[PDB]
Amino acid sequence: MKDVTIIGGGPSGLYASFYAGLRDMSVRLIDVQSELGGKMRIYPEKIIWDIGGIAPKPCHEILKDTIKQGLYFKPEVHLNERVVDIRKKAERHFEVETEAGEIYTSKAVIIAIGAGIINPKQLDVKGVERYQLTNLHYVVQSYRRFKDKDVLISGGGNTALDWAHDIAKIAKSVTVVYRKEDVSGHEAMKTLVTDLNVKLCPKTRIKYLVGNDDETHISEVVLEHVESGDRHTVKFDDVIISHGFDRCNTLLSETSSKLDMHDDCRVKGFGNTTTSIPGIYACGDIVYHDAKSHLIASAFSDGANAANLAKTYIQPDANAEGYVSSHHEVFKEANKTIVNKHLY
Amino acid sequence: MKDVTIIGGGPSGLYASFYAGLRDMSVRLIDVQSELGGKMRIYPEKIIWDIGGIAPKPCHEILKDTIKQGLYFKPEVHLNERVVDIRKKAERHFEVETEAGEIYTSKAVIIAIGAGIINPKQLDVKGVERYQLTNLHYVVQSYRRFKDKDVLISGGGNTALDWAHDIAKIAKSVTVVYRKEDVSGHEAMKTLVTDLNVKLCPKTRIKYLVGNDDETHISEVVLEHVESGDRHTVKFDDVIISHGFDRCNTLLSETSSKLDMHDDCRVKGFGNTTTSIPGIYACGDIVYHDAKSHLIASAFSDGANAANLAKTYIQPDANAEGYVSSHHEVFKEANKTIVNKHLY
Ligand SMILES: Cc1cc2nc3c(=O)[nH]c(=O)nc-3n(C[C@H](O)[C@H](O)[C@H](O)COP(=O)(O)OP(=O)(O)OC[C@H]3O[C@@H](n4cnc5c(N)ncnc54)[C@H](O)[C@@H]3O)c2cc1C
Ligand SMILES: Cc1cc2nc3c(=O)[nH]c(=O)nc-3n(C[C@H](O)[C@H](O)[C@H](O)COP(=O)(O)OP(=O)(O)OC[C@H]3O[C@@H](n4cnc5c(N)ncnc54)[C@H](O)[C@@H]3O)c2cc1C
């Protein structure tokens, strides 16, 4: 039986998986998404400054480091699986169940679901689920691909307007279709007005997408004025959508094992990642305790704590904490090529 | 008046300085040592795995990143100054005093002194304080400089024996002088016996150092057998000393402002970096609270918490936490060259 099932592969669950491995626990890691990272996947292009010990660089670069670390001890990773129940059969015997009916057993459970399940708002056009493999975007990880391109952005929110300005620096042109009701960034908009190669189209929506003959890429877009109904069709190289996010977090309200909650979104942590049920621990944005910050740094220290507390739940007389990695024997073989590279 | 005085420039105090700056507070940072880093300076060559988001690399490399981050907002840094007192004149008015009689004022105080003041045990030979600028070592940051060198190591502890084996891989020869009483690493010693270019010298001490004619480097060493008194003089390229550490931590026992303590070494944190005195906060290894780990990751999340709590002490209705760096306006100008490098 697995020592611990970790539900959620954001920064907190990833680090928890790593530290659980450091404490010599077998790990099962589960996430509903097709990729790990959680909310970090929402802002890949943004420069992160406030992670301890890390010089500022794009979030997506930091995410890749965090995943590699999280998966170092080779946990059993279940992607594309939504957890819908947590049951405690007995001490050191838990059941975690997915919406597809899979049931996973463990001696402990770590809940790391953060803000829950989050996806970008899908463009309301049939049927465009194939263009998101190519030139229909819901994130922007870098701007390089847009050099000398004609680019369409849909949305008037801060994110869309910032994207528009930055992409316009190297793109041939940027067109922004939006509703004025969505515009909360007054200064961001004024900047776009002064960008010579940005065309602002208020009261305008994407109505249809025109695919190429291979039907694998967007070739043109049919735009519609929301009052006049006037339509025109314009060629674009890329289409970027920023319509907000769909959020879903039903697990802890529907679960068999009820935990004391801080609010309707957060588990009450008892001074740390300890929950109201022994054997279940909560780390990251999902938990509230007095030492929390809404930071990745806190998600990390939470993950160490959860792994430690799970270990001593499973082994009452195990060491309260993990051995420092610097002198940890589990890394001795792996350290060899690193030293050799760095010290010789 | 400075917003906050941070006592101690280890990982926790460094990150606290950074995050205090993120919260738009003016910072004074003080450390007794000639360089920042605290206990990290003790293990520069060791590979660190358990800092969240950081791929394994030498501690000294990670330290340099941590210092650069810690000093980003250009705090007022006082090196080589030992803090001996903390006084609270009134709310938002603290006095921090050094052993040289300097008195620094602030609206808040963050205590980040970790395990206190630590220095390697100095070789008991007059007068060798000048060779430590050149080839008398108390740390080993990398092995490269010892290639084809004849190297002397004094000490039988785990650190000395590990150093000896690793240096012997590329050094011409390694001689280890030690007392058997100090040997706790049975297997480390057996390895050295099989190292062909390692000479083991139990019951032997460094008696004298013979300088070069410039008197700037060690040229030869006079070794003495601790029983027979037999002496011989051997040429070495480098001398490395591992005799343990001198430790001193009198501040919180001698201070004017008495804090509730966890033990004789640790301040009691009230669920977090909050101490028994409003306006004073403790972060890192110095504090005990229920969410602690003896990790740099916890030192970091502690530092964010201390900065946050100090801010709201100074400004009762300031935001409870800092704005995430990704969207923080203070970084907008600095981000430009970074984006440009990374995103364009
Ligand atoms: C736009 C933005 C900017 C930010 N910038 C910064 C910054 O600069 N610095 C910083 O420190 N923090 C920043 N943050 C906050 C940081 O992203 C979060 O603190 C961190 O992501 C929380 O990590 P987590 O693992 O606890 O939760 P999450 O990141 O939310 O990960 C939760 C994971 O659990 C999965 N999951 C959830 N539920 C279920 C279920 N029922 N079954 C299966 N799987 C499931 C989700 O798919 C998700 O992958 C920012 C946040 C936002 C949104
Ligand atoms: C050999 C070793 C291996 C380790 N390996 C790891 C690892 O792999 N991963 C990990 O996460 N952790 C590791 N640690 C632990 C980590 O080093 C500590 O958790 C961390 O250094 C604590 O940081 P700190 O800022 O709280 O305290 P410290 O590092 O102790 O820094 C305290 C600073 O305050 C200064 N100071 C103190 N007192 C006074 C005074 N009265 N006046 C002025 N200045 C003052 C000191 O000079 C010092 O610079 C290791 C520790 C040791 C010793």
UniProtKB/Swiss-Prot annotation, chains A, B:
Q: Where does FAD bind?
A: 12, 31, 39, 43, 83, 118, 285, 326
Matching SUPFAM superfamilies: FAD/NAD(P)-binding domain
Q: What Enzyme Commission number does this protein have?
A: 1.18.1.2
Reaction catalysed by this enzyme: 2 reduced [2Fe-2S]-[ferredoxin] + NADP(+) + H(+) = 2 oxidized [2Fe-2S]-[ferredoxin] + NADPH
Q: Report the InterPro entries cross-referenced here.
A: FAD/NAD-bd_sf, FAD/NAD-binding_dom, Fd--NADP_Rdtase_type_2, Ferredoxin-NADP_redctase_2
Q: What class of enzyme is it?
A: oxidoreductase
Protein's recorded name? Ferredoxin--NADP reductase
Q: Which organism is it from?
A: Staphylococcus aureus (strain USA300)
Which cofactors are required for activity? FAD
Q: Which domain of life is it from?
A: Bacteria
Q: Name one Pfam family in it.
A: Pyr_redox_2
On cofactor binding, the record's note says: Binds 1 FAD per subunit.
A molecular function (GO) held by this record is: ferredoxin-NADP+ reductase activity
Q: Which UniProt keywords apply?
A: FAD, Flavoprotein, NADP, Oxidoreductase
**Oligomer and partners:** Homodimer.
Which family does the record claim for this protein? Belongs to the ferredoxin--NADP reductase type 2 family.
